[PDB]
Design a protein around this ligand. Structure first.
Ligand SMILES: CC(C)(C)OC(=O)N[C@@H](Cc1ccccc1)C(=O)C[C@@H](Cc1ccccc1)C(=O)N[C@@H](CCC(N)=O)C(=O)N[C@@H](Cc1ccccc1)C(N)=O
Ligand SMILES: [Cl-]
Ligand SMILES: [Cl-]
Lengths: 99, 99
């Protein structure tokens, strides 16, 4: 699809068998989701943005369906104020900016 | 142009007569730039992201040339770790996400 930017570019995702809403975020190198459990092992990590940093848990090889495009990648989980789909996954669904 | 997301979507901007680089950031409602002076008045404001909040100075009706497209809009200035062009301006250059 073509997503305009007059509203937040939110999409529905399915991950770990749950339905969630997430922001398509070209400004995020990574994909960061609020608290949730996920199949498998993880390594701790920190990430930053505008106001500082947070600790997240990093899970590799997670399956996620973003608008029905399945992708497998690293998903980070922790106290982010909002679910964000970052460039690690945006590249995998072929997402581009266009103007 | 069409901008892929394998690299950060950095673009050159011209603002306040200065040349800067900034990230086209669909995850940002607003445009936030590191410290710089700007013609005119402003009002203080706070903004958040991952990590927390920062104080910024909000300037209205600023002209900005983003990849050669002129737009006029609010620009926030303050301690962000990176220059970001948010949706407030992305709409004005007609920027869309496409997949
Ligand atoms: C208007 C405003 C600027 C205030 O909005 C936002 O914060 N939007 C959020 C997403 C968000 C939306 C809504 C609510 C909360 C968050 C993001 O698009 C912002 C972007 C802007 C940014 C990019 C690079 C460096 C600094 C900042 C952001 O925080 N991206 C992050 C998302 C976290 C992640 N790992 O993907 C990002 O790429 N972080 C990187 C880069 C980084 C290094 C050091 C310090 C800061 C950042 C990281 N791996 O930690
Ligand atoms: Cl990945
Ligand atoms: Cl504006």
């Amino acid at each position: 699809p073509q997503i305009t930017l007059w509203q937040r570019p939110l999409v529905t995702i399915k991950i770990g068998g749950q339905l969630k809403e997430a922001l398509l975020d070209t400004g995020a190198d990574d994909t960061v989701l609020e608290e949730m459990n996920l199949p498998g092992r993880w390594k701790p990590k920190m990430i930053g943005g505008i106001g500082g940093f947070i600790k997240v848990r990093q899970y590799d090889q997670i399956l996620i369906e973003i608008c029905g495009h399945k992708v497998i990648g690293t998903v980070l989980v922790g106290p982010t104020p909002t679910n964000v789909i970052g460039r690690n996954l945006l590249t995998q669904i072929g997402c581009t900016l266009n103007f």
